[PDB]
Amino acid sequence: GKTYVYDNRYWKNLGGVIKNAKRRKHEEKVEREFDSLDKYLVAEDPFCGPGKNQKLTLFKEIRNIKPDTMKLIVNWSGKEFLRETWTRFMEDSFPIVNDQEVMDVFLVINMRSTKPNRCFRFLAQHALRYVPHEIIRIVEPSYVGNNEYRISLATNSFEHFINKPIVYIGTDSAEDEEVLFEVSLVFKIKEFAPDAPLFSGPAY
Amino acid sequence: GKTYVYDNRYWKNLGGVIKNAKRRKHEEKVEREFDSLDKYLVAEDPFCGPGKNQKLTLFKEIRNIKPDTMKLIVNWSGKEFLRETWTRFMEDSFPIVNDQEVMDVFLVINMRSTKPNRCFRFLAQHALRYVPHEIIRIVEPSYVGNNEYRISLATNSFEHFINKPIVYIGTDSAEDEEVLFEVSLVFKIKEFAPDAPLFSGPAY
Amino acid sequence: GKTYVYDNRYWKNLGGVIKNAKRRKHEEKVEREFDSLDKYLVAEDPFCGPGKNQKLTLFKEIRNIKPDTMKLIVNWSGKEFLRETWTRFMEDSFPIVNDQEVMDVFLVINMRSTKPNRCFRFLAQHALRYVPHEIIRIVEPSYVGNNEYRISLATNSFEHFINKPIVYIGTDSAEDEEVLFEVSLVFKIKEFAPDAPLFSGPAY
Amino acid sequence: GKTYVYDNRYWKNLGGVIKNAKRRKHEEKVEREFDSLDKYLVAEDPFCGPGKNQKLTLFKEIRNIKPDTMKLIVNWSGKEFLRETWTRFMEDSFPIVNDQEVMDVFLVINMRSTKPNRCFRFLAQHALRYVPHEIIRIVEPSYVGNNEYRISLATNSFEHFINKPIVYIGTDSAEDEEVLFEVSLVFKIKEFAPDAPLFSGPAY
Amino acid sequence: GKTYVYDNRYWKNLGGVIKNAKRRKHEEKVEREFDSLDKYLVAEDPFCGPGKNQKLTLFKEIRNIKPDTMKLIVNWSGKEFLRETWTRFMEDSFPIVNDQEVMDVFLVINMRSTKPNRCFRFLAQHALRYVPHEIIRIVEPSYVGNNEYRISLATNSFEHFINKPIVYIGTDSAEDEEVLFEVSLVFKIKEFAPDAPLFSGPAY
Amino acid sequence: GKTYVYDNRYWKNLGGVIKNAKRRKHEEKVEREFDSLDKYLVAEDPFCGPGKNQKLTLFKEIRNIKPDTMKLIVNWSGKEFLRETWTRFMEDSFPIVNDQEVMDVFLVINMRSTKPNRCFRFLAQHALRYVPHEIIRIVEPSYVGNNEYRISLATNSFEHFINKPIVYIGTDSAEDEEVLFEVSLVFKIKEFAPDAPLFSGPAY
Amino acid sequence: GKTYVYDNRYWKNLGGVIKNAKRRKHEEKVEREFDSLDKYLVAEDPFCGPGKNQKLTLFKEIRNIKPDTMKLIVNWSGKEFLRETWTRFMEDSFPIVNDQEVMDVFLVINMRSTKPNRCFRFLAQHALRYVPHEIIRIVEPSYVGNNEYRISLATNSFEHFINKPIVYIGTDSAEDEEVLFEVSLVFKIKEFAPDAPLFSGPAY
Amino acid sequence: GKTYVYDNRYWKNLGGVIKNAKRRKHEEKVEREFDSLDKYLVAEDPFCGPGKNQKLTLFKEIRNIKPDTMKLIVNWSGKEFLRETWTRFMEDSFPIVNDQEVMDVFLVINMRSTKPNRCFRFLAQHALRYVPHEIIRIVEPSYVGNNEYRISLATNSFEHFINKPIVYIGTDSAEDEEVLFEVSLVFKIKEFAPDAPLFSGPAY
Amino acid sequence: GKTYVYDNRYWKNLGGVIKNAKRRKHEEKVEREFDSLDKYLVAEDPFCGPGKNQKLTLFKEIRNIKPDTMKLIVNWSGKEFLRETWTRFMEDSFPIVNDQEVMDVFLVINMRSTKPNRCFRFLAQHALRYVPHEIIRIVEPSYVGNNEYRISLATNSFEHFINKPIVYIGTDSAEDEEVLFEVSLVFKIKEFAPDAPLFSGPAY
Amino acid sequence: GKTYVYDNRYWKNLGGVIKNAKRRKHEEKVEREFDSLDKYLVAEDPFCGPGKNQKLTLFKEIRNIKPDTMKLIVNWSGKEFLRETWTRFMEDSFPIVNDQEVMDVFLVINMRSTKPNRCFRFLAQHALRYVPHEIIRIVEPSYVGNNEYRISLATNSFEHFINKPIVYIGTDSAEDEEVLFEVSLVFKIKEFAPDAPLFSGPAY
Known part of the structure; x- marks a missing residue:
């Protein structure tokens, strides 16, 4: 909207x-509600939050899961979990x-x-630890939001790095379900990248 | 609302x-209505608008106004209107x-x-021109908004300046009303005041 | 609603x-919106506004208007416009x-x-001035609100009065339209009628 | 909102x-509802209603009230109620x-x-009459609105005036409550004060 | 909702x-409306209000009521009204x-x-007084709310007690209606029951 | 929605x-509000209104404006304003x-x-007239709507045409602001283009 | 609303x-709902629908109907139904x-x-066929909308035309109801009336 | 929204x-309304409904229709209607x-x-039958929804098939209207296409 | 709602x-609000969340708490806290x-x-550590949600397990409050229960 | 609102x-929404939450920050961070x-x-660890809520205490911004202050 002048009279768009x-008329009652809500905090989703995301896809796996049960998704020993973590991270990075x-x-x-036309929810349970059972019964599980369960796990060579997380997945289905996993x-x-350019040798 | 950090996890106020x-969710449908209204303009109220206001109060006057009539408020000749305008403006300025x-x-x-406890509206009519009638009948008047009728009228000495507006006021009352006027x-x-200071003589 | 009294107890209608x-509960938030809107002004419609209306109907006219064009409605010379204005005004008045x-x-x-069952809008353009074209093409016209275009034009005998507005009308129609005009x-x-009666001669 | 005049054009605040x-647009459907409600009456609160209020505070009293019971607040004989009423009224007046x-x-x-931090309601019952019981059980009492029970009870010397209301209060509490009373x-x-002044003697 | 503590961080239910x-946000505008309504009072329904209810059913009666008329429901003499009142009250009490x-x-x-499938309202009129008419015409009656008309009427033996209300009922029906009455x-x-127990003789 | 016929029965889309x-149900209460609003008029924005727009860009200019002040944007003499107006108009046209x-x-x-990331509003004042001050102080200015101030200013050769508007701009900023102007x-x-074609010579 | 012109400025009613x-702002979300509803059709009420209505009133009849039953309204033989249909149609037409x-x-x-002051609904059942029962019991009837049951039944002399519908009506009433029928x-x-006039003999 | 795990604590998106x-909070009151509406049925639009649509366009036609009248659109004999139906269907199929x-x-x-800029509705009437009138008067017609009237009409050679619908269209216009028809x-x-493929000869 | 077929016409419940x-019409604006809220996370209540709940009730305790103070609820030494934790857990498990x-x-x-009829809130403070004070003053406490404060504390024999949390509770009351505690x-x-049955010996 | 008594009739404020x-009428549908929200928790803001706040202001600092970069705010060695923490805490405490x-x-x-009239947001990143870069580029930063970034960092003499956090701040501005920091x-x-007074020596 602009300002017009016609013979010392001022005009504005309607x-x-x-x-x-x-x-x-619209602008403090809602601010009172927000001010009380401001006494509390929410955590930022880490994948939408600060810092880069680096998804190192390890493997695919298929399991046929029976009702009221969960199947073990990953069974690496501590050394294998560390070998895979170090190797995939360093090769990519x-x-x-x-x-x-x-x-x-x-x-x-x-x-x-x-399979399409299936309607069920995913159920999960992990342990940060020993040979776990392949199949467990469902007891007060975590109900997976959508199709993803995200577990926070909190060098020169792998040997220098050296010098385990396990996960179960089930469904709330009343029939056997064949599930494809991507871990x-x-x-x-x-x-912390400096505000400095990359120069071809020699610099300057 | 602030940003908290607890062990690489980010937190914001709820x-x-x-x-x-x-x-x-609240923020374009109203903007469509405003965009069509923007094809038209409104004038700014002059007293709330650009430029200074300088109210030179000329006189007070009392008239007893009969129903369906209007009384002449000011009857200056052209020279008297100009004398009063020039004199009051220059004396004040x-x-x-x-x-x-x-x-x-x-x-x-x-x-x-x-008098208090009176409920009526004011009616007005002016002419920018001859001896007008003291009392006229009301014919398609201007209905005064509140208690004010504002008429736009569009040197060394008064003689050098030389080298008339009339106003009627009535009411929509069914009884005689005694009205106090301030003209x-x-x-x-x-x-156009320069960005320059006032210095005592001599300057610098 | 009235006031009843029953043994020193007072009663009012529910x-x-x-x-x-x-x-x-209902009575200031809307007043804040109106107070900001009060910094601006709107003009009063003149026909609904102060002063008498006096409609001097001059003529009727029929024109067949082609799409994307406008036809000249009135082609009086300056003297004819003045003759018609003076004559119609004085004869009626x-x-x-x-x-x-x-x-x-x-x-x-x-x-x-x-013709009935026609759906189109009227387009207009005037000039306050020379022989104008009978037919012009439509270029950024005024869109007529409803069926009326109202142009503000801002003695003893016509000779003593002596001692021109032109108008084009078109339509937004895609077919030829026959239009009846009333100018x-x-x-x-x-x-300024005095508060004085009309007496038969002699007065008093 | 005012009325402006600019070259015979009239202007009003938006x-x-x-x-x-x-x-x-806002102004009769609600009036239909009110018109039907007007077939009925409500009594005016006497303390907010016509006539002066004159609060003669008689005494303070403390009672410890057991659950499901009421204690007698006032036990004056008819003569004592009249003595206190006459004396307090005349001394003050x-x-x-x-x-x-x-x-x-x-x-x-x-x-x-x-005691603070107590959450209960007051229960009351009176009689306009004999020695009443000090403690009664609660049977269909009056639930006191807030902290006040107001009972309408409908000369030269007290002897010339001569020539009783009782009240019980309880609570809906499940524990004993110590209550402070002000009667x-x-x-x-x-x-009926005349429109006549007070003059020092002699008048006029 | 509870309070959780996790490593000196405090947590509350969402x-x-x-x-x-x-x-x-929800909690004073409604309080302003209620504060003005508080200048007025409403009476408590007596049957829902303080004090016990004791319904002494006297009789049943059937009357066939003609349109625009009312039939007398009870015709006791003053002594019979008092005999029935005293006897029923004392026998029950x-x-x-x-x-x-x-x-x-x-x-x-x-x-x-x-009879079922009848749609009409009841009309009533009483008198607190003489042999009344059996059948009267309807003149500005009381419109009965639902099926009940409730009239406030404001010892050793009946003789010691000694030492009349009449009621008419009609309908707004355009046909004769057979009505069953319960008076x-x-x-x-x-x-005023003391906080004292009932003991078998002898007490203590 | 169409009309179906099935064995003399007529059918319409739901x-x-x-x-x-x-x-x-939706279609007059709003019309009452609009009918009262119709007693008043609004002006059409000229650039969105009738007639062609012809923007003759004269120059660009940069000024560093100090808080509470305005700088002169254009200082042409009357003859230079007329030379530039005539020349730019005729060369383009x-x-x-x-x-x-x-x-x-x-x-x-x-x-x-x-500069980006600056948050302030523009303030303006013009004069239609003498050497104006380069820098003035801000006194009751016009608040510019957005980034544009639009001033209505109300032949063979420039000599035959012969035979001034000034503008100040400031900001409401508390710091110096560098502003780019386009005048x-x-x-x-x-x-008034006739409904007549352009023919190559000779016509017909 | 009209279009005003004041010195090349255009004005429209507010x-x-x-x-x-x-x-x-008001004008597509509702259109989405209507577009899905447009996949389905509704039949036009025949009496409000195309074609003329011609009501041939046959008779009046009174029946006293017992609760949970229906009485036969019409008992014509096939020939009598046809005689009455042909005769009434041809005599009127x-x-x-x-x-x-x-x-x-x-x-x-x-x-x-x-009888007035009766509140019940009508129940109906027909058969298009033999001597039907006069009185039947109510079994899954049609609930009559209002007071009308409308049954679609799908020459020189009656003999040339030659060369039956039955109806039961009951009520949901718990008492006997006397019902007046109009069949x-x-x-x-x-x-199919041609666009041709009626002329007196001889034509032309 | 996903599921996060941080040290045995479970997290979900806000x-x-x-x-x-x-x-x-949103999810049964609307279901009660829908449950009562479910006692009734609506027909599916046939062109949006089950089965293929096969539009065999027969001809185009232009008629000039006078106010209050309808013109005959199609006048085929029974044999011609059948010839055209069989021929167009078989040739296309x-x-x-x-x-x-x-x-x-x-x-x-x-x-x-x-013609454009015409505002009127279409009126229709058909007959499933004789030489009909070319022009009829309008009597209780079917009001066409939009621009389409859809009439349900309920072999080796045409001879083997052998071994009529008429339509009138008018308008609600007060002037003659020229209408283009597409029949x-x-x-x-x-x-009933089997789940079997098409093989080139010989199969298998 | 079902699907009906009547002579190749399809029908659905209204x-x-x-x-x-x-x-x-109802189904994305709310989804935009939820999508922005999805950038943040909330923790699941642990007692409503994954994993079994096992409530080992240790003791009951009564304390009389003075206004503006807190009393120590538990004073176990580190060894006693561990003895009670191990013993109660193992005995139950x-x-x-x-x-x-x-x-x-x-x-x-x-x-x-x-005591009933008391209206106050609970205030709490803990320490994870030394002989604490029995009575402390209230300084920026945790306001207990409802009646529960839940503190996360983050083998063969008790000796093999070997080879302290303290809590204060107060109230916001202005009087002494007697509080019953259950710790x-x-x-x-x-x-992690396998999907394997329990068999009586010998298995198989 | 109170309780009035007038001749055994009870009265309450309207x-x-x-x-x-x-x-x-207002009081469970919202409770269903809150009950589902109660399965989740929010953390209390620590500065508004339990425990005292003790703000030890360390220093002020000014940095000119280039677009798309962040400048190091604090560069203390581990020993200097500990010296400043211990000294400021103990001196104040x-x-x-x-x-x-x-x-x-x-x-x-x-x-x-x-500088005033600047519109931009603050961006931050910290590290809890070595000489960091003075200037880094912005990569997935934390967007500062308002003007504060709050990092949780999780004796006799400083020597006895002995026997590092770094922060970067940038802006989302497209120009250099001079920022004043307060750390x-x-x-x-x-x-844990006992409910015990302070006595002058000797006590008692």
């Missing part, structure tokens, strides 16, 4: 005028260019039905 | 979070310090009942 | 009581009884389709 | 214009200056817990 | 948090155990159609 | 039927093909910050 | 301007002027209580 | 949490590959004005 | 049809059948007034 | 009566009177523009 007056901090590593389980390690990276 | 989400433009001069009629000239002044 | 309490002021003269064009001069009269 | 139009009518006398019981006589006075 | 914030006050006696008329005396009793 | 019935009327000429000032003359042209 | 802007088609014939039963044949006529 | 809680059922044949009349036969086909 | 159309993980142990304080250890158990 | 009835627990220490960064350590103190 829309802008009605908008400004309605903005005074190299060269590690800047000073960086690994904020967290999430063991992410993506799950989907191998990944999602690293949260805080990169 | 109120601010709900406010931002509701701000997305002097010294006229800066380059200025008289944007307009309003002949303002403020009116009120001399003023409200000048709209556009002042 | 409706009036609920109305007064709801009047306190005489005797002019009181002191009066011609506030304005509107050249009013009333237009209608000569009038609407005078806005500010009458 | 807010006032929108307010008047919305006042036509003298000189009785004008012609006046005692519209009513209310025996008012104000009650409060002597008063609230007179409703209709004063 | 529902309780949203409820408390909305309680601040004995033994009268405690000090009690008869707050009021209501003559209650319960009425119903002896009762509803006593409102204020019982 | 949506159209519900739409027509809801159109009767030639050949002027049809009979046309210059409805108005707007001196348009477009303004923007040369243009926006002509409003009423073109 | 009401029309606000109405057009609100028409943009003659002369049959144009080519016409009998779209349908409805056997219409209008029913009302002979009619409502013909739906599709008239 | 949006999903608020959505699930609001889904409990051949080869008829599968077992199929002709569910219905609709005689569809599409109508439009040959088609829309077949509703229920195709 | 309720289902209106429900489906309203489902299109044995036999521990499956592989299980103690997700957390909550020290739960349930508190209630020993428990609520274990969160993640049970 | 407002209180309407309020109680509306309280029954002494004498430490009661048994107290340091619940947490927040490194708080308050930031503001040194503080906010301690959360849980004070």
